[PDB]
């Protein structure tokens, strides 16, 4: 994303994973039931396990936290699990006591730089 080259032909996608903790509403957090998750809750791989495939180049330096969203300073979103329900279906940018869950997107965008996987193994 610079105004000198037209940043599209590259294929770069922001790779992400929401880490979370769980606590009683107004309590002490422990690792969540599914620590690494998707925004919905689908357990995903962890940033270390998250590696570059043949054809993909990491663009960003490590997994950081995404602050380009309506999220807390450290990325933590307001996931309150009001019974009955299994998951937070609402997220807000403020650490509120009703937080049963909180999660944040660790970000590491990646880029194919177009040329890395440009040709495919023809069989």
Swiss-Prot record:
Tissue: Expressed in myoblast and endothelial cells (at protein level). Highly expressed in cardiac and skeletal muscles. Also present in lung, and at very low levels in kidney, placenta and brain.
Subcellular location: Cell membrane; Nucleus membrane; Cytoplasmic vesicle membrane
Region described as Disordered: 21-50
Top-level taxonomic group: Eukaryota
UniProt domain comment: The C2 domain 1 associates with lipid membranes in a calcium-dependent manner.
Known disease link: Angioedema, hereditary, 7: A form of angioedema, a disorder characterized by episodic local swelling involving subcutaneous or submucous tissue of the upper respiratory and gastrointestinal tracts, face, extremities, and genitalia. HAE7 is an autosomal dominant form characterized by onset of recurrent swelling of the face, lips, and oral mucosa in the second decade.
Main function: Calcium/phospholipid-binding protein that plays a role in the plasmalemma repair mechanism of endothelial cells that permits rapid resealing of membranes disrupted by mechanical stress. Involved in endocytic recycling. Implicated in VEGF signal transduction by regulating the levels of the receptor KDR.
Assembly mode: Interacts with DNM2 and KDR. Interacts with EHD1. Interacts with EHD2; the interaction is direct. Interacts with RIPOR2.
Similarity comment: Belongs to the ferlin family.
Protein name: Myoferlin
Protein source organism: Homo sapiens
Gene: MYOF
């Amino acid at each position: 994303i610079d105004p000198f080259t037209a940043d599209a032909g590259h294929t770069e996608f922001t790779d992400e994973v929401y880490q979370n903790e769980s606590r009683y509403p107004g309590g002490d957090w422990k690792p969540a039931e599914d620590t690494y998750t998707d925004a919905n809750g689908d357990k995903a791989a962890s940033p270390s396990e998250l590696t570059c495939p043949p054809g993909w180049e990491w663009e960003d330096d490590a997994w950081s936290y995404d602050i380009n969203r309506a999220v807390d300073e450290k990325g933590w979103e307001y996931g309150i699990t009001i019974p009955p329900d299994h998951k937070p279906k609402s997220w807000v940018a403020a650490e509120k006591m009703y937080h049963t869950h909180r999660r944040r997107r660790l970000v590491r965008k990646r880029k194919k730089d177009l040329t890395q996987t440009a040709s495919s193994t023809a069989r």
